[PDB]
Design a protein around this ligand. Structure first.
Ligand code: 4AD
Ligand code: 4AD
Ligand code: MG
Ligand code: MG
Lengths: 434, 434
């Protein structure tokens, strides 16, 4: 490959040096007698100045016709100039047009288009600066998680996606034909992580999870990226400490590295800056009282839906925990509160500013008889869970874990109006394509 | 959480210090008047010495009954002793039996069991030392890949799993009902990575890929982990350089960190040590000649199946490339060799010692008309690929990429007898459970 110079490298200190740019036309404007092509690549935008008496009539005429997203190679000499973007421009000596484009279907400001058009052309939308900024934020949050997980001594595992058991209820399970049988798409790797702690003690995975959720909200995808941890020996309170340390590190590391991208989306970084341990903790009981005090018609035992969570977040300026939920609005695998068996040792972590749940976790039931009884009570077939019950037969230990919704976290960090914008190619009940 | 001391931390320098172990009984033997419990955790095995006159009759009797995989907490004093494992043992003061076990269904040497029994109890098999060693190797290879990818400036993305297009042929596609429509499970994220290079230039993903492969070989899973890279500007020769640099780094970093685990599986590390650039490169033409010279009944134009690849590997002592395949045994998206349009600019990387293909990659067709013609020739519906064709309409650039099978790589590194042992919970046509 003939090596290129990235746009971000075009700096005043390169004055007088030859560079080869490779990228796509961002804008094309005549300035005086010259053509100014702003060329974008994955690192920035550089002004390339095309002069007729330097490149010749043929090249000059070709340059006039280059619309947005035309692919080009540009060779020229860097000139330091304070008026130019980045303080330096390229005086073009050679222009190779790879493909001229004049009708790119995403507008220069994509948010002047209908969101439905942007989704119809999602494969083109992702190359635009704001959409790409979201993907850089997403990769940085995940990089940060892996740094924290490595340092704190967790083992990464690669759990199955094709499964035979519901983790989070049958209502949101995708079913498929699998040769001579049927399989489901995993809603969560949790049960497999619970198997893995017996060999590795502290484990995590990052997997796509699948939820056949009919409701078309701004917080639900049918496919999402799910960062899950499970640990031997830890109780609910221990796992909550892990959650706040991990999320704080993810957010602070991403503030450190991606300030520029975040400032494209936020006028106020306060809640992100506030994201350090210890996070506020309220009981579900306290949540109900806060909600009732603000006029919300909620009764103890009711689920906290998105609208309840929204009002609740008004009282907080950073992520916070709600803990100790009524048993029967939570999943079958959760350990009862030994002080009050009406409740389970569950906690959710909610983001402020209306975003609501980003993590769901719990301490797991570690008693065989109790777990089996709960499976039966929920109308589940113990045969589908025999292997999971085995974990309570062959050296059971107390353990806890949780799952983080990566897109939910990205949506809060960037104050997105819909979770879909945090997925490279979002999947929702009416959207499968591109 | 009351803090524990990991088995690996029990060292002679801790002589006289109190420790709290937490783990599972590995062996239980009476030695003289005492009970020696070897306790395993995720980091090793420590000898815990239980003396009747120290712990009392009740505890001593409980200790006698602890079989393999009994879960225990042990508090005691470290004593340096050269006869003990790791040069140090724990003199037990307190033993808490969490759950006594006597009938763990995996034998102490698992390979004395039928592989079918181990798979039936896969959730228990994964906690055993060899199986856990495979998972530590797998996580280290992947950690190494991410280190290399970060340093070399690639962006991580999170592509879709629910899709509408075959990347690697319709024969191995899983189909499912998706609300009012149908979806497929991704065979490969490649086409989406190709969209993403227009914004990010150099991208990668690690995703589960799904292949409805009926043939029950030792090299095929129906679900596998797929590390894929795609890069603007790079041709086939460029991407081959990336492949050998990445794989060499993965293997060398894993040799550095996981020598102990690898030596559980290999008597000879030579081929791993040999894995540094430049890898040998032979053309498909050369491969055919080598094969014909060794008596293999292969004709130019024929696919190189697993048995052909096996014989071919005999001539190599490290991974190697085969390049320049006949067009019609390769996928629709591959760029024709401009010097010889009977061929495409494809290469596979084969592991030695009979393992065969670990990477499939190519330069991609970047001309709209050629790609459309190929889609039509293969009986594919251009409507399902309109968005992919769009990438050749809106600023097309030359580009190349590849996919690495993580389990295939692990199987070669550890000289496994079947790829299934490299998956946490393997999926094959007859195996969906646990
Ligand atoms: N390992 C565990 O303990 C996780 C547990 N088994 C679990 O699946 O919990 P959830 O609360 O359903 O999901 C966990 C998180 O996953 C996200 N999530 C859950 N459903 C989601 C959906 N339909 N779309 C997008 N994100 C979704 C939310 O952030 C939620 O807090
Ligand atoms: N991004 C790309 O260019 C990849 C390309 N779209 C692709 O899917 O190529 P394959 O050669 O089919 O698969 C790539 C690798 O994926 C692995 N693989 C492919 N099929 C596999 C299977 N059924 N089981 C286990 N591993 C399998 C093999 O290592 C193979 O070399
Ligand atoms: Mg939840
Ligand atoms: Mg292949």
């Amino acid at each position: 490959m003939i090596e290129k110079v990235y746009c971000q490298e075009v700096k005043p200190e390169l004055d007088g040096k030859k560079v080869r740019l490779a990228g796509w036309v961002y804008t094309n404007m005549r300035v005086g007698k010259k053509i100014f092509l702003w060329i974008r690549d994955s690192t920035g935008i550089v002004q390339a100045v095309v002069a007729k008496n330097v490149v010749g009539e043929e090249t000059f005429e070709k340059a006039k016709k280059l619309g947005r997203e035309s692919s080009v190679i540009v060779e020229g000499i860097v000139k330091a100039d304070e008026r130019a973007p980045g303080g330096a421009e390229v005086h073009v000596e050679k222009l190779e047009v790879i493909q001229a484009v004049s009708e790119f279907p995403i507008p220069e400001n994509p948010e002047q288009a209908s969101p439905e058009l942007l989704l119809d052309y999602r494969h083109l939308h992702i190359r635009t600066p704001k959409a790409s900024a979201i993907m850089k934020v997403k990769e940085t949050l995940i990089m940060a998680a892996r740094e924290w997980l490595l340092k704190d001594g967790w083992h990464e595992v690669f759990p199955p996606i094709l499964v035979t058991g519901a983790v989070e209820g049958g209502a949101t399970l995708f079913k498929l034909k699998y040769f001579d049988k049927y399989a489901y798409l995993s809603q969560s790797a949790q049960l497999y992580l619970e198997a893995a702690i017996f060999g590795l003690e502290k484990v995590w995975s990052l997997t796509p999870s699948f939820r056949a959720e009919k409701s078309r909200t701004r917080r639900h995808l049918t496919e999402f990226w799910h960062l899950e941890l499970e640990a031997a020996w830890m109780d609910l309170w221990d796992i909550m400490k892990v959650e706040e340390e991990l999320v704080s590190y993810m957010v602070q590391r991403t503030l450190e590295l991606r300030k520029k991208e975040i400032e494209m989306f936020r006028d106020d970084l306060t809640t992100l800056k506030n994201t350090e341990p210890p996070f506020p903790r309220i009981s579900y009981d306290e949540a109900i009282d806060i909600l009732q005090s603000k006029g919300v018609n909620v009764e103890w035992g009711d689920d906290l839906g998105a609208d309840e969570e929204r009002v609740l977040t008004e009282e907080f300026d950073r992520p916070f925990f709600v803990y100790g939920y009524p048993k029967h609005i939570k999943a079958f695998y959760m350990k009862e509160d030994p002080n009050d068996p009406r409740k389970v040792l569950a906690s959710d972590m909610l983001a402020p500013e209306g975003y609501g749940e980003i993590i769901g976790g719990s301490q797991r039931e570690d008693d065989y008889d109790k777990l089996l009884n709960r499976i039966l009570e929920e109308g589940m077939d113990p045969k589908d869970y025999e292997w999971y019950l085995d974990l309570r037969r062959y050296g059971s230990v107390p353990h806890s874990g949780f799952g983080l919704g990566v897109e939910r976290l990205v949506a809060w960090v960037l104050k997105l109006d819909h979770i879909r914008w945090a997925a490279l190619f979002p999947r929702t009940p009416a959207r499968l394509y591109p």
